[PDB]
Amino acid sequence: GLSDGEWQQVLNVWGKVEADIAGHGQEVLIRLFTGHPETLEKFDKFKHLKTEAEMKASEDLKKHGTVVLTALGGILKKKGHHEAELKPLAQSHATKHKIPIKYLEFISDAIIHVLHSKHPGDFGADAQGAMTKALELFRNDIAAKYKELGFQ
Numbered sequence: 001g002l003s004d005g006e007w008q009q010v011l012n013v014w015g016k017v018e019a020d021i022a023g024h025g026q027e028v029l030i031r032l033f034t035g036h037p038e039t040l041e042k043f044d045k046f047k048h049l050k051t052e053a054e055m056k057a058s059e060d061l062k063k064h065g066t067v068v069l070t071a072l073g074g075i076l077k078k079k080g081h082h083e084a085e086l087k088p089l090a091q092s093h094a095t096k097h098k099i100p101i102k103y104l105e106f107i108s109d110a111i112i113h114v115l116h117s118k119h120p121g122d123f124g125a126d127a128q129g130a131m132t133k134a135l136e137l138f139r140n141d142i143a144a145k146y147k148e149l150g151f152q
């Protein structure tokens with residue numbers, strides 16, 4: 001798992017996200033969609049977004065970004081003790097939304113990129129290591145539930 005020190009880093013980094021949850025959420029989703037257009041096809045409500053300008057202009061996309069990062073923040077603040085929080089998400093993403101685990105790798109990478117982009121020189125090597133571990137833990141625990149369901 002993560003050490004106490006590592007969790008403290010993760011939640012310190014998370015402070016940056018919480019100052020502007022919508023802005024971070026928006027940029028994370030745009031990074032995902034532009035980098036991996038197939039991901040956009042999983043969202044009936046974002047399929048109409050034909051350009052980054054349109055994405056940037058979408059208030060509903062920002063709204064969804066807030067929902068997303070709020071959920072992730074809840075999970076992170078449990079410091080690995082997140083079974084109750086993670087289970088329903090694993091299940092809706094496998095069974096309803098059909099999100100391959102690869103897309104969760106994509107969005108994890110997007111979060112790391114966005115943190116650097118918004119906080120250049122202020123997301124240090126130790127912070128990136130800790131945040132990376134936390135996101136891998138999240139991914140890995142979801143993947144365990146995906147395996148249970150035989151999804152993908």
Ligand code: MNR
Pocket residue numbers: 039040042043044045067068069071072088089092093097099103104107
């Ligand atoms: C590639 C696409 C997908 C990725 C990656 C992804 C990654 C993540 C992610 C990782 C950090 C978190 C946290 C996350 C959290 C959520 N997510 Mn998700 N999610 N996610 C969807 C696609 C994806 N998610 C879709 C599609 C919906 C339904 C949206 C709608 O039509 O209103 C949804 C909905 C949701 C909801 C609403 C409740 C529900 O349906 O369970 C939350 C919360």
Ligand SMILES: O=N[O-]
Pocket residue numbers: 029064068
């Ligand atoms: O964008 N993930 O729901």
